[PDB]
Design an enzyme around this catalytic site. Sequence first.
Site, PDB file in Angstrom:
ATOM      1  N   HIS A 131      88.004  23.010 -19.256  1.00 19.57           N
ATOM      2  CA  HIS A 131      89.234  22.237 -19.238  1.00 19.57           C
ATOM      3  C   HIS A 131      88.972  20.808 -19.733  1.00 19.57           C
ATOM      4  O   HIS A 131      89.900  20.014 -19.870  1.00 19.57           O
ATOM      5  CB  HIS A 131      89.872  22.240 -17.837  1.00 19.57           C
ATOM      6  CG  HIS A 131      89.158  21.394 -16.829  1.00 19.57           C
ATOM      7  ND1 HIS A 131      87.981  21.777 -16.219  1.00 19.57           N
ATOM      8  CD2 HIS A 131      89.490  20.197 -16.290  1.00 19.57           C
ATOM      9  CE1 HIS A 131      87.605  20.837 -15.367  1.00 19.57           C
ATOM     10  NE2 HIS A 131      88.506  19.869 -15.390  1.00 19.57           N
ATOM     11  N   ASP A 180      89.279  27.191 -14.071  1.00 18.82           N
ATOM     12  CA  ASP A 180      88.232  27.028 -15.075  1.00 18.82           C
ATOM     13  C   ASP A 180      86.975  27.725 -14.557  1.00 18.82           C
ATOM     14  O   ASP A 180      86.229  27.148 -13.766  1.00 18.82           O
ATOM     15  CB  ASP A 180      87.972  25.543 -15.355  1.00 18.82           C
ATOM     16  CG  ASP A 180      86.916  25.315 -16.418  1.00 18.82           C
ATOM     17  OD1 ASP A 180      86.081  26.215 -16.647  1.00 18.82           O
ATOM     18  OD2 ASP A 180      86.924  24.229 -17.036  1.00 18.82           O
ATOM     19  N   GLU A 204      88.515   8.079 -15.899  1.00 16.61           N
ATOM     20  CA  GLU A 204      88.952   8.070 -14.496  1.00 16.61           C
ATOM     21  C   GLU A 204      87.996   7.227 -13.646  1.00 16.61           C
ATOM     22  O   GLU A 204      88.319   6.865 -12.514  1.00 16.61           O
ATOM     23  CB  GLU A 204      89.107   9.499 -13.944  1.00 16.61           C
ATOM     24  CG  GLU A 204      90.188  10.294 -14.688  1.00 16.61           C
ATOM     25  CD  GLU A 204      90.140  11.788 -14.426  1.00 16.61           C
ATOM     26  OE1 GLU A 204      89.873  12.189 -13.275  1.00 16.61           O
ATOM     27  OE2 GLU A 204      90.384  12.563 -15.377  1.00 16.61           O
ATOM     28  N   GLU A 232      82.401  16.448  -8.240  1.00 17.92           N
ATOM     29  CA  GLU A 232      82.791  16.752  -9.597  1.00 17.92           C
ATOM     30  C   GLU A 232      83.539  15.534 -10.141  1.00 17.92           C
ATOM     31  O   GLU A 232      84.759  15.525 -10.180  1.00 17.92           O
ATOM     32  CB  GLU A 232      83.654  18.016  -9.598  1.00 17.92           C
ATOM     33  CG  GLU A 232      83.653  18.809 -10.879  1.00 17.92           C
ATOM     34  CD  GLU A 232      84.843  18.488 -11.738  1.00 17.92           C
ATOM     35  OE1 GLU A 232      84.796  17.441 -12.414  1.00 17.92           O
ATOM     36  OE2 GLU A 232      85.821  19.270 -11.726  1.00 17.92           O
TER      37      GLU A 232
HETATM   38  C1  6CZ Z   1      89.415  16.134 -16.149  1.00 15.02           C
HETATM   39  C2  6CZ Z   1      89.220  16.528 -14.683  1.00 15.02           C
HETATM   40  O1  6CZ Z   1      88.727  15.399 -13.957  1.00 15.02           O
HETATM   41  C3  6CZ Z   1      87.872  15.753 -12.833  1.00 15.02           C
HETATM   42  O2  6CZ Z   1      86.812  16.374 -13.087  1.00 15.02           O
HETATM   43  C4  6CZ Z   1      88.047  15.100 -11.425  1.00 15.02           C
HETATM   44  O3  6CZ Z   1      88.427  13.949 -11.339  1.00 15.02           O
HETATM   45  C5  6CZ Z   1      87.725  15.870 -10.202  1.00 15.02           C
HETATM   46  N1  6CZ Z   1      88.690  15.731  -9.115  1.00 15.02           N
HETATM   47  C6  6CZ Z   1      88.869  16.980  -8.422  1.00 15.02           C
HETATM   48  C7  6CZ Z   1      87.564  17.716  -8.004  1.00 15.02           C
HETATM   49  C8  6CZ Z   1      87.781  18.565  -6.729  1.00 15.02           C
HETATM   50  N2  6CZ Z   1      86.971  18.030  -5.706  1.00 15.02           N
HETATM   51  C9  6CZ Z   1      87.423  20.017  -6.913  1.00 15.02           C
HETATM   52  O4  6CZ Z   1      86.278  20.311  -7.341  1.00 15.02           O
HETATM   53  O5  6CZ Z   1      88.324  20.928  -6.600  1.00 15.02           O
HETATM   54  C10 6CZ Z   1      88.434  14.543  -8.308  1.00 15.02           C
HETATM   55  C11 6CZ Z   1      88.897  14.555  -6.896  1.00 15.02           C
HETATM   56  O6  6CZ Z   1      88.288  13.414  -6.181  1.00 15.02           O
HETATM   57  C12 6CZ Z   1      89.338  12.639  -5.637  1.00 15.02           C
HETATM   58  N3  6CZ Z   1      88.938  11.245  -5.700  1.00 15.02           N
HETATM   59  C13 6CZ Z   1      88.892  10.456  -6.807  1.00 15.02           C
HETATM   60  N4  6CZ Z   1      88.458   9.230  -6.478  1.00 15.02           N
HETATM   61  C14 6CZ Z   1      88.201   9.214  -5.135  1.00 15.02           C
HETATM   62  C15 6CZ Z   1      87.735   8.251  -4.216  1.00 15.02           C
HETATM   63  N5  6CZ Z   1      87.412   6.920  -4.678  1.00 15.02           N
HETATM   64  N6  6CZ Z   1      87.589   8.586  -2.901  1.00 15.02           N
HETATM   65  C16 6CZ Z   1      87.886   9.824  -2.471  1.00 15.02           C
HETATM   66  N7  6CZ Z   1      88.331  10.772  -3.294  1.00 15.02           N
HETATM   67  C17 6CZ Z   1      88.504  10.515  -4.629  1.00 15.02           C
HETATM   68  C18 6CZ Z   1      90.506  12.953  -6.434  1.00 15.02           C
HETATM   69  O7  6CZ Z   1      91.726  12.721  -5.665  1.00 15.02           O
HETATM   70  C19 6CZ Z   1      90.352  14.364  -6.751  1.00 15.02           C
HETATM   71  O8  6CZ Z   1      90.838  15.175  -5.651  1.00 15.02           O
END
Ligand code: 6CZ
Lengths: 343, 343, 336, 343
Positions: free
Chosen positions: C273, C24, C125, C116
């Site tokens: 996205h 994205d 989430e 993010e």
């Molecule tokens: C619709 C898309 O939704 C999003 O934007 C996201 O959730 C972003 N995503 C991906 C973003 C990514 N960093 C990127 O930019 O590459 C969330 C990430 O945070 C982790 N995480 C969720 N809770 C967590 C918690 N308590 N403690 C530690 N980690 C956590 C998840 O496992 C995930 O890896």
Amino acid sequence: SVFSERTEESSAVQYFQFYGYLSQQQNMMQDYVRTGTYQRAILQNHTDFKDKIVLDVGCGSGILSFFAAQAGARKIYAVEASTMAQHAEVLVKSNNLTDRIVVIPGKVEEVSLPEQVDIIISEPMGYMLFNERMLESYLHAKKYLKPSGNMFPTIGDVHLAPFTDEQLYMEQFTKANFWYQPSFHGVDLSALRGAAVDEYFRQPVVDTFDIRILMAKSVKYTVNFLEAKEGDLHRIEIPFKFHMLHSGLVHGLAFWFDVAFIGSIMTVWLSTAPTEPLTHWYQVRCLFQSPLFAKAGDTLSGTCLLIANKRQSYDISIVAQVDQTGSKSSNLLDLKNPFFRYT
Amino acid sequence: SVFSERTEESSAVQYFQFYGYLSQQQNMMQDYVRTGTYQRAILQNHTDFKDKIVLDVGCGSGILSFFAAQAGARKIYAVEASTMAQHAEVLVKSNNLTDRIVVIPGKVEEVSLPEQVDIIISEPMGYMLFNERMLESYLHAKKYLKPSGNMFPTIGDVHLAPFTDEQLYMEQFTKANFWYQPSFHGVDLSALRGAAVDEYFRQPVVDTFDIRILMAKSVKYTVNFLEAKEGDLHRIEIPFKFHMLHSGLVHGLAFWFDVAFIGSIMTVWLSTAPTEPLTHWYQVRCLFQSPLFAKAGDTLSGTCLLIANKRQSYDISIVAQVDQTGSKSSNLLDLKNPFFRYT
Amino acid sequence: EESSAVQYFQFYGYLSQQQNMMQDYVRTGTYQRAILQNHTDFKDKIVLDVGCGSGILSFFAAQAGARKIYAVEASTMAQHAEVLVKSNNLTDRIVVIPGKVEEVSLPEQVDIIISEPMGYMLFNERMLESYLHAKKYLKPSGNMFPTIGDVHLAPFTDEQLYMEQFTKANFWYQPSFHGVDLSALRGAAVDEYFRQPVVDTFDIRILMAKSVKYTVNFLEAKEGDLHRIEIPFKFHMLHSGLVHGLAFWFDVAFIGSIMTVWLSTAPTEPLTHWYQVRCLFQSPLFAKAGDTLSGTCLLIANKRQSYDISIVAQVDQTGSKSSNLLDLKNPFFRYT
Amino acid sequence: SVFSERTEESSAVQYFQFYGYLSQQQNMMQDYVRTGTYQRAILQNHTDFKDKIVLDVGCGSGILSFFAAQAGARKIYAVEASTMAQHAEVLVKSNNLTDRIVVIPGKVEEVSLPEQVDIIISEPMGYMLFNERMLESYLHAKKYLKPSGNMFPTIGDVHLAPFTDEQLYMEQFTKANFWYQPSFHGVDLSALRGAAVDEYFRQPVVDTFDIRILMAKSVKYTVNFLEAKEGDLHRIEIPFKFHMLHSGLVHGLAFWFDVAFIGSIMTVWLSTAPTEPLTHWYQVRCLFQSPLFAKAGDTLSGTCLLIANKRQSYDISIVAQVDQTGSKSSNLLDLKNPFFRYT
Ligand SMILES: CCOC(=O)C(=O)CN(CC[C@H](N)C(=O)O)C[C@H]1O[C@@H](n2cnc3c(N)ncnc32)[C@H](O)[C@@H]1O
Ligand SMILES: Nc1ncnc2c1ncn2[C@@H]1O[C@H](CSCC[C@H]([NH3+])C(=O)O)[C@@H](O)[C@H]1O
Ligand SMILES: Nc1ncnc2c1ncn2[C@@H]1O[C@H](CSCC[C@H]([NH3+])C(=O)O)[C@@H](O)[C@H]1O
Ligand SMILES: Nc1ncnc2c1ncn2[C@@H]1O[C@H](CSCC[C@H]([NH3+])C(=O)O)[C@@H](O)[C@H]1O
């Protein structure tokens, strides 16, 4: 009964069969101007309803009684002669208002109500206001009205104005001239041409139009429902004097109507004017048999006489003369069978 | 009389009043397929009329009698119950056919004819062939028919076929869902939703359609007017078993009809099929409240039962099932209140 | 619930999902733009990356000159991030700390938190709570990237979508599906289908009023603030017609020392996205131009890492009201 | 219970949440092949049901129980663990079958039935038959089956065949090579390319295909549900020797399955083969990490080993070699996370 004495049964049957369809109630309900204006009128005049006894004449689906309920009515008698009455009972039950709304199946002229009411509500206006002759039931219901009781709507205005529409006038002959041919599949039809012309001209035209065809400010005939008696609507004589604003050929008279809800807090208007958004009443036009030429500043005077008939409608008689020239035209129309031209 | 015992006063009044208008006659006459096909049937079979006695049941404007005169009939008794009878006589005179066309005002069930006739002509077909119940008058008229006389039309074929049209179904469902609102201006209408759906789906849909929506070859039901008796049209039971040519949703049954003029010189067909040029009868569709899924090769079997009613129309019951799965639908339609969908 | 969290972190453990997010360009480019153009907010600073995934944001922080970045990640992706840190020769600057930000111990307080955490409708989430929870490691004068989030709501008209959903529910209307009467469940089926928020994009012309905005300031807000989110609205209708529901989208702002950078998922902006989200009314509301449409969108946090959504809307002039419930956990992805 | 012992809590919760949705039931119900073949299988073997006691394992909406009621069962116990159980109860009542169908909420491993049953019906097939591990519940339910009781379905055939699909194979590297770039926004991602390739190849590919991609007649592995025990499904070893019909590169193994209903009157087959109409099961392909060249006439021999895991699915181990050349290939796939490729 009073209803039956003034209406051929055949018509009444068709009328109440007509209003027994949910689709027709829906058709009326989906007119936002109508329903919204009734609701606005009832709720903005809540002091006219809170803790009052109300009569809903011809409640149909019951919508106005529910509006009266929103405004705080103590008891609402909702009278309905078509089978729609059962559905109203269903809606009353499902809206938990059985303690407040009592559906009464039957004609308001024939049912008996147990007490006097503070206010009558109804939607009895037809084409040209008077069509369907339900306004008489509305006025008849005042036998259940307390003195100094109120009527919603309180007054009704019929408006008349002369118009020009060369194409509409020409249309009648174009349609009638079908019969003016010596060999339709070998048959000479021409002998029926005059009869066809007459038939078309006796039909009031139901539709809307550009206000720019109007040639004088309208003449208004007012019925005050608080003062008027049922008998007042059997013969309605509307004299007119139009002061022509435009020069041209007058092909007939245009009709529309307003009703007013005169409450303690405010007066609310429901208008079917061609200057206002379209409603399910549209407007009605009655042609002269012969157009009349008028100059701006001239006067077009005459009479529209509405005579109630046994088919729950009116025979319309129109006489018009250009005072400055003496040119004359008339027409007689059957409002029960209008021509729906709208597209 | 036979007509009055089986017909409400109100319905008959509106019916014969309706046909009293020249404009409706113009509409029928201006159907060129109808009028031209009738003229073709009569003139190409001129020997079935030449120096014959003719009865025209419900002559209207008289057009069929004039065709019979063109084909050489010596005497035509033209029976007509509406006021149109007055106009037909005008045409008989202006066309100098008084020695040959005799207008007889009244109902065919009630008038007296001076003699038996060699052939009966009429245009008694309504929507789905049977609406208006004039076929019974047509059959009733055979009391005036000589033992080996003929009828024009001679036979009538009703055709049935299942169709798919998700848009029409959803259109009606869209209309019905108005009554699904839990808060229309604050009012819960939903208790009536079921009532609204029933009412809307009881309306046969009158219009035309592309033939590709048809899911199987049509089934034919034939009425032979030479042999059938009036009583036969009170209850019409049409069994059907369709062999599905396409897989999909069956949203209902489409209806149309043919009539045949079986003359000595030719058989002439008048068809209202969707494969043929459009007529004022269009085609008729009866929706299921819920569609049935079928695969190609499946058989869709059931019954269409028509019950004559007092309003000169039919109560329609359609029951259909996909034999392989047991998927079933049952529906009831009121042919007197159709939905006119065209343009 | 353990059950929800397991699936969540298994989902984010797949490289293909990281790839999907990274590709994205609006998202990734806008994040990079926000971090690099506010490089003085990172230069020689201590950073916390909450939910670092592949590590991309930590790498942006390293590019901007951060002295130390603690990259916390609870999924197994944490292991892949460490691979990238080594192969990118940043072991002296990026420290992956596997585990949940609520559960790990960090060696020092940080100057800025990056993350993010936005889901569908921003709040899905419930990761914003972790983001806000992480503020325990934030210095008094610390910053958050993103700093604020705007939720935008607007009424829309879309008969096609409504009938699309009703057509599906109409299956349960059948009195004889293979001889079985299903109809007793039709009410249950409609309820279920109309509980699905619709994720996709749309022409802005379907919007019937200027949007209403609800702002969350991540610098000010508490974790606890997000269990019950009450969003009142009053729309001044610009067009007459049927309101079939409410459309939702969100913006976030990175309010740095040098400039503010916005990331927008609005239907007027290039698609992300996140697309946009629509909540349908079971019954549409008729409104005239000039009428007022008022009500509340209430988000109640549940144990499945999402929200129970109640939307109640009313045309003030007529009293026509519609109520609806959406299960944000189970949306309808309509985009193709 | 045996169920809780073979499934992590997290997986079971998601599974039964998934199956609690009406839309899911609907999707299965709207698979005409499936639903229709079950109905045919039950009705055409009515002697296996008439006045019998039936167990429906995982009844969902209850549809198969209703088919069993249609075939004349005196009593049906319908067990369902998701909340769908409630909706099933509603349908049994509204279909007036409470005296014959008893909905039992809960897991078939955990609930108690009041009596033994004559026949067990179920729809427990997942991708490549075994996915979701519901076949174990089906076999577990045999504790309630009378000796000489029957099972519908009675047997399950898993079919395997080698295929060539260069584009599908390449698709994987095309996707993983995303990570093979030295400066993604300044970041070198390439160190993760190998892991990405790995992840993609561990996914069985769900979709359909032209049968012409198949390079040898399939090998069949049969589970006889009448004879099999739960434990038999924890480890499934499928040896194969394909005799190559076409020359080319083999990119992996394609899987599909049949089940048969062996009744007293007839055997009915439900097939998900690529030669048959598409079902919601499509077909499944497992790629080799490295394709194998084979000549027409060569033999491709090896093993497909399916090992059950606690995420209600299987770890798939495939080893294959061309005997004539000794070129060897492997793959390890996780059926729990397939790639849904169908478009
Ligand atoms: C619709 C898309 O939704 C999003 O934007 C996201 O959730 C972003 N995503 C991906 C973003 C990514 N960093 C990127 O930019 O590459 C969330 C990430 O945070 C982790 N995480 C969720 N809770 C967590 C918690 N308590 N403690 C530690 N980690 C956590 C998840 O496992 C995930 O890896
Ligand atoms: N004399 C009468 N007595 C009772 N009901 C009548 C009478 N005349 C007409 N009606 C009914 O009055 C209604 C007029 S239409 C207005 C219906 C409803 N109040 C609404 O506003 O939606 C129809 O339902 C008629 O059947
Ligand atoms: N029972 C009846 N007796 C006499 N006329 C009838 C009867 N039923 C219907 N009609 C009339 O028959 C006509 C049907 S329309 C056919 C009219 C004419 N054949 C033409 O094609 O122009 C109408 O004019 C009806 O009023
Ligand atoms: N162990 C189990 N006990 C009870 N129900 C189960 C079990 N495993 C799966 N199910 C249910 O079995 C169904 C699988 S598919 C639905 C099958 C249904 N008979 C039909 O043909 O439509 C789902 O509703 C599951 O929730």
